[PDB]
């Protein structure tokens, strides 16, 4: 029903395009952890592109002008808006299927998350190149909450490793019982083996 995407290790534009397509096609999409997003090109290169945008503003009343959002969440939004017909209705509903966040909030910290192999950095670039993190970049241009958002992900990790040990414990038990009562399930095991399961 609903699709969730961890953005750690992705690239900005190659992700956005895949999103905008699905979104127009009825799907509801949720992008998470937008501070892990990377960009091609070194830091200085990319900083200028953003700072040059901050010097575009209506001379006569910049209470009206281009609004220069700072956060990683809102930047990824502002990107995708460049790939849609936002000045028409079906464009405007598309935006309202998308939710973006920075960090992993409580609804979605207990759900499995997807990845695209087509917009990853290890796949689309050569390792002898440069790249930049969008989290750092916002901090330099006035994003004020890089520092608590860190503490909150730490606490998240401190609880997930708990969950995995429980899950990792139980697998041992699942596996031990199999080899104990094998004499009782020896018949139903075979047919699975004959048809491509359990082998």
């Amino acid at each position: 029903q609903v699709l969730v995407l961890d953005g750690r290790g992705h690239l900005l534009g190659r992700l956005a395009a895949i999103v905008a397509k699905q979104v127009l096609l009825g799907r509801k999409v949720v992008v998470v952890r937008c501070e892990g997003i990377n960009i091609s090109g070194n830091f200085y290169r990319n900083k200028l592109k953003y700072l040059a945008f901050l010097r575009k503003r209506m001379n006569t009343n910049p209470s009206r002008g281009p609004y220069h959002f700072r956060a990683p969440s809102r930047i990824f939004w502002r990107t995708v808006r460049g790939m849609l017909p936002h000045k028409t209705k079906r464009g405007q509903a598309a935006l309202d299927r998308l939710k973006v966040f920075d960090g992993i909030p409580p609804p979605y910290d207990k759900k499995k998350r997807m990845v695209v192999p087509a917009a990853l950095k290890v796949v689309r670039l050569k390792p002898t190149r440069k790249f930049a993190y969008l989290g750092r970049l916002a901090h330099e241009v006035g994003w004020k909450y890089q520092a608590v958002t860190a503490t909150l992900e730490e606490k998240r990790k401190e609880k997930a490793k708990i969950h995995y040990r429980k899950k990792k414990q139980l697998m041992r038990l699942r596996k031990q019982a199999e080899k104990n009562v094998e004499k009782k399930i020896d018949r139903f095991t075979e047919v699975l083996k004959t048809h491509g399961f359990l082998v």
Partner: peptide, 19 residues
Amino acid sequence: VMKAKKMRNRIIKNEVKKL
């Protein structure tokens, strides 16, 4: 396969409950 896979997992769950 449907009928077999079912029972196989009934037993394994019912065993894990005991351990």
